[PDB]
Design a protein around this ligand. Structure first.
Ligand SMILES: [Zn+2]
Length: 119
């Protein structure tokens, strides 16, 4: 279970410091830069880098008030087909939000494929 999310984020951060383990962006460093930029500079910063691939809805929230969870998430290293898996620390990793969303979107298709193959 990932429900104990604060705890898990902080434990993974002790080792990974908000660096995506798939694409190696330093998502925490971008968070801090955005947080401390004036709102009026945030849009151009976000569209100049890997965050440009996030949903417009999320990017609008990030311009108003960025939070750490907009930039990186903890997720499984070995997920089950369709999502889930063991939530022990040795099966967890930092993903930037763009990688996390690709993974989530893939797992929703996988859940589709599972439902299909059993109808
Ligand atoms: Zn990434």
């Amino acid at each position: 279970s990932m429900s104990n999310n604060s705890y898990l984020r902080a434990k993974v951060f002790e080792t990974e410091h908000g660096v995506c383990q798939l694409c190696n962006v330093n998502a925490q460093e971008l968070f801090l830069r955005l947080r401390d930029a004036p709102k009026s500079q945030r849009k151009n910063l976000l569209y100049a880098t890997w965050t440009s691939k996030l949903p417009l809805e999320q990017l609008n929230e990030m311009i108003r008030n960025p939070g750490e969870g907009h930039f990186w998430q903890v997720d499984h290293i070995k997920p089950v087909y369709g999502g889930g898996g063991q939530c022990s620390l040795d099966n967890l990793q930092t993903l930037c939000t763009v990688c996390h969303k690709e993974r989530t979107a893939r797992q929703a298709k996988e859940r589709s494929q599972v439902r299909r193959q059993s109808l």
